[PDB]
Symmetry: T
Subunit: 170 residues, 12 copies
């Protein structure tokens, strides 16, 4: 494995998770009214688990000899996803669209990392797989709410449970 | 008490609970969208408690000298209720209709067993009464969601609590 | 501080909390249907915390040399708020209107008590402040549900948590 | 069963429990001195369990198609017991007399409901029986304290345990 | 109900439970070897739950105006069962025979009490029913071990759980 | 990956787990006598974990765009294993034979799914691997009991622990 | 050590604890009125810990090759203490006298066993010492209540804690 | 704020709490007999919470640049209260008099500190307020026991709970 | 109070906390070697509590009618503190210098907010006071490590305890 | 006490415990079949508690100025017991013979240490006594399984409880 | 035993523990800087356990008919150790010297008490032994930190665990 | 896969873990002084997790048809690592060198096993991967302490947590 490339991938994914922890706060606060109370706890579940994803990526970055960038704006500019901005018309459907685009991008990032470390770096692969479980379940929550396609998921009992990444957490 | 008749009643009710544990899984997965997120945890609450009802009926069946049937298809064909099939147009209102018919039938089954063992078999009566509490509360949840008639119930804190049948559970 | 005036304020506020514990029960039971399941746990959260507010006001009343009135009808007639009556047309929006008027009055009562005991009676001030936190958060829940204005609150994990008044509770 | 009669009985008993939750607060605060510290926790135990009795009666009332009355004064005027007023000479013995009259009336109310729903409405019967256990134990506590007749009861570990009605509570 | 007769029944049953708590200790210690390790935890489960049965009968005896007899030998001589003596040849099969005779007698005692208080004394009936659940499950454990007839019971997780009588325990 | 083939494999394996949850109940109840008490908790451990396997397979099926079949008999007819029928001579050795054939088939099913999704679908692979851990340990328990070959496993502390699949459970 | 003598001492002390568990039940129920509520929890604390003393003595008896006697009346007749009979005039002071005589005898029994096994049988010595701690604290509770001599003890948080003998308990 | 003056106040109050932790031990041990068992747990509650007050004052003293005095006798000589000496005639009423004088002095000390840091040092003010809550509740317990004036307080569940100062404790 | 000014103050302080949560991660990772292991848990304690400070500021911002800025770079540019950059020579002493400058600035920010809302906005004042407690204790930890001045603080038991702000957290 | 002799005794006993932790693993894995499932948890209980014995001996060795030997083979060669080798014919009875010889030797080792430190080194004596309790109970388990002599012991609830040595453990 | 001599020894040792609880607070606060953070939790562990030693000595003093002295200065003047004064040059090494002298004196005090009550007063002996365990482990912590001699101890998980004296604590 | 080769690898790795559990005890005890207290808990964390690694390897060895060797010296001679001997000059830096060589060897062993079972034996691969996570984190702890290279790890909350291997543990 070319380890500088994996370090770029991992830093970009961790910037995606950190920015996501911010933008989801904003999105959570605008899920308002009767429809929004339905999706608020789900946004909060995804936001806390994603910040846990950041908390799991950083130790692996420093394991491989990389560092987080000096400036937090450099970090934000490195995000592998685009910013989950609040829509101009922040309806519940428009917000769900933004959240679904974010978790679809996140699934792709971690699929890319797993397809990079498969049979080559088992620790990073296992970590990217653990985050990929939770990003797939994030995408399913928001795609069932926005489109109605049944994907059989439930709401975590408490936000930030992160059942698949917890063994990388303290 | 004619104990073969009570054994038929109890086996038929346990087949109702086992099939219900399956069909409610299917119904749970199709409660989708913004309206469905409202009723999903309630379907899950009823599904887990009903499978707990099966888990409480089987020991009493073997107490009285009966057995579950050899083949699982024989068992399913013995269900005292009709199959809670997914409706052809699986809207939230049509699904609530199916769930309400299932829990109304279940209330009738356990009313029948209690009216059979009253003053005659106190253990089976107490057990049928404990399940009857939870089936009455299932019916009330779904009738408040479908019709709006206030029956004063809340959502269990965690699915499968089964507060009335727990003392028959392990 | 004129302590008979503070005792009137505190008794009137405790009658507001006790009556509110009753009327919110009624309002909780009529939050029915698909929209009402969304607001039921929020009504229950506010009802239990408000009865906890009564449970915190009574010890301070007897600290200052006051008593609850002999007759429970005298007590109800002393409520600093108006009765959160069930609306003639008990829709979800009309019920939210009633709940929001009740929690807006409650915020005003406890603002008045804090503006009375500020720098003068620190124990009563701290207690009125603790209740005022929870009444402000009640008002925000119901104003976000009724109007959509984002005020950034979540649902307590379990009803009656009363995180700000708990240190006055047993 | 004539269900309007059972609804009257159940509403009157729930008004008895709600008023009792108020009047026992007052009685608790006047159990003072060296003798009163002995009976205070017992008054608190009975007060919290009785308010739990109210919390268990209301869901059954709305199950059967009844409602709590619109006005809280109507409710108080419906109490099946007389008001546990603070005695004119509020000695420990006079207060125990009042508490014993209240719990003797409560035992009679729930005996009446059980004698009404026996073999006829098993859910309401089971609920009235669960409250009747705790009202019998309330009467025994206060009759042992006032007269010395041994009835073999202990103090609940924590107030409001309600071991017999808990399965109807949330 | 003739209450002196019910007091005799209840005192005799409580002597049965107290003596049983002793004799089961002895029987537990002689369940030795490879076969006995299988039945030891089951003997211990039944012994602790039976002593819990004594702990639940005594408060009801003093509720009804009765007392335990002055002398512990009078008490032992009042046991409604015969003494679960260690067999002359204390094999695992002979010990199981003794345990099964004891729990069959206990089922009969509590069936007799329930058939006495049915529709007449609901508190004592509920208590006798709760003990009767656990005595029926004791009989089933020992009859499955001695004869092999399937009655579908499992081993309690911890001895003395007493899931049916716990609400009468402190 | 041809996703309809993986959906067939996953539905067939989930029917195997659901039928197994039924048939193991029956097998559990006939593990009787002194020898059977030894294997009962082990049957119960495997039965509960297998029903947990069903509870983990269904969300992945609806993730991939599949559904459980409409009718529960269709589902049972799709089981990748043969029915763990009670043997004609239900001795402890014959029952162990049936249980060992069932868990050997289950190991083969999940080996097949893992050999299908390896390096191709990491979420389904991880899930099939988690179930495969527990099916390998089921096979080892029953092969040590039936043949005596040491495979170094212990009994789970509580049934249905499912230590490897729990992160897919709620 | 002459081990038959130590076995006599240990069997006599265990009969003292078993009879005490009975007689303290009776004494507990007659600690009535305002004064008795003060001493009831203390009687209950001593009763449960003493029955725990029986539960710790029996394993050591069977360790040393002894057995509990065949008949429970033989056992009661072997008690190293005299029977804590209910006094003819069962006042709170007379009951405290009886309880203090019982715990003074118990302190003497275990002092005798410790003075027997000192430097000779360390396991039995440690066990007799652990019971002797709790019997000394029982005597101090009852001597402070009856005479007022300060011995600095508090009430255990929950009855039957047995902090010194717990490591011999299961 | 003149910070040396606040440091004197805080050191004097912490010496009051440390000496109080000693003298309350002595007072606790002499609350003997039937009346004293009533007040013992209340003395223990106040003693442990007061030693917790010392544990909260010391970090704030070292925050502000002060130190505890070198010698423990200097410290004791700095106590803002007078020594809660055991009365010459240590009756329950005389001991309650001493305890009430101590907690009345403590309320005055912390009122003085709060009136010093109000709007000037918010951390010390909040800390002095938290201790002042618990000292007001100490005074109320002892004034209700000694005089009978109802102040509506209960006994903490466990000694040293310190619900208001706990957030300053470790 | 001019509420736009308080909203600026609160948004700037929340940007300080969010950036601090990032920069402290970086600082935590470079506290290396034998000296750094001493300060790592303290950096982690401060980092988690500061991110909790962000989690408490956002609900109050949306209460007062403000919002977090659309872009995360705008947010970072609004931080009331300067960026806790990793020093060019990242020794343990240089890192402690940076951490101490950050927590000294944070103490000043929250002193400014409290001096703004004192007697004017009690909810925001209480919140700013709760954060100010934890920022004062952060400054004391780092000033004791860097200079040796005794300020009497200990290490929180687990990172992110936030004992003073927890009642604002979920 | 000659402390080099006590250090030899303690090092030899700790080598006995460490080797025993290995050999019991092997013995545990060969307790197979229907008889072996009975004794497996008992072997596991003894193995974990014995490794806990090693964990308690090492701190006392370094207290007295001794060390564990440099090489792990030197350590194994110092074991005060002989190696609990797997028997050539590893039947359940032959394995029980080996386990009983090991725990009989262990009882003798710790009897020797206690007879060495009695009245001379109280810390080491107390530690050797705590291990001696658990070794006596190990011997009793295996002697009841192999010979049937009743010694009145039960199975620890969870392996490695070590109730007597836990206060020396971390 | 001459009990006045043992009472002197026990009162002097309890004054040593109480003064130590004060002086260790002071010593804890001056363990500053990078080296001091290493020893702070160890000082806190010893300080809390020593105050627990005081909490265990007082009940035994009042058991034997002794009392704590009337005045707290008399008590401090009775300390069996010398005052653990802050050194004139309070370096980490000088502070460790003071702490090691204090715990060496404490080991000698409790060795003296055990050598006094050996075979003569088993309760006091057991108590002095329990404190002597913890004082030996205190001495080992400080002697390993000051000199480097390996004595194999670890840091208690939480301060004031007091694993050996806890059974004397409430 | 050639299964005898994998059995050699797994037995050699389990001997590495068992010997490591011994040698780390020795290394832990010599991490003395002010610097050593910093690294002691980290040595203890690694030692307990490594012994947990042994506890996870043995069941997989007996799954695959292998056994631990008859003699514990044969086992030690099979260790895939070299013995982590105490250095001749046991400074903190020399001890860290030894620990880092041990965990670097362990990372290589488990990398070798994973590179052997990849896509071939998924259970053993998953197990070797779980141990490899914890061995990589062991190496990072010791390399950050010895060299200062930031690898972003923290100290486990309690020793032997083994977050990655726990699902293989009981
Ligand atoms: Fe993410
Ligand atoms: Fe059902
Ligand atoms: Fe019984
Ligand atoms: Fe006793
Ligand atoms: Fe104080
Ligand atoms: Fe901050
Ligand atoms: Fe000490
Ligand atoms: Fe390892």
């Amino acid at each position: 494995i070319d380890v500088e490339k994996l370090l770029e991938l991992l830093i970009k994914a961790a910037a995606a998770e950190f920015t996501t922890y911010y933008y989801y706060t904003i999105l959570r606060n605008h899920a308002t009214g009767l429809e929004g109370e339905a999706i608020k706890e789900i946004i909060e579940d995804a936001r806390l688990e994603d910040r846990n994803h950041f908390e799991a990526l950083v130790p692996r970055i420093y394991e491989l000899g990389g560092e987080l960038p000096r400036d937090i704006r450099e970090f934000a500019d490195l995000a592998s996803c685009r910013d989950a901005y609040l829509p101009e018309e922040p309806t519940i459907e428009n917000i769900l669209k933004v959240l679904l685009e974010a978790e679809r991008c996140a699934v792709g990032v971690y699929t890319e990392i797993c397809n990079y470390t498969f049979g080559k770096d088992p620790r990073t692969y296992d970590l990217a797989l653990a985050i990929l479980h939770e990003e797939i379940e994030h995408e399913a929550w928001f795609e069932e709410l926005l489109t109605g396609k049944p994907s059989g998921h439930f709401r975590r009992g408490k936000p930030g449970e992160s059942p698949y990444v917890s063994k990388f957490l303290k």
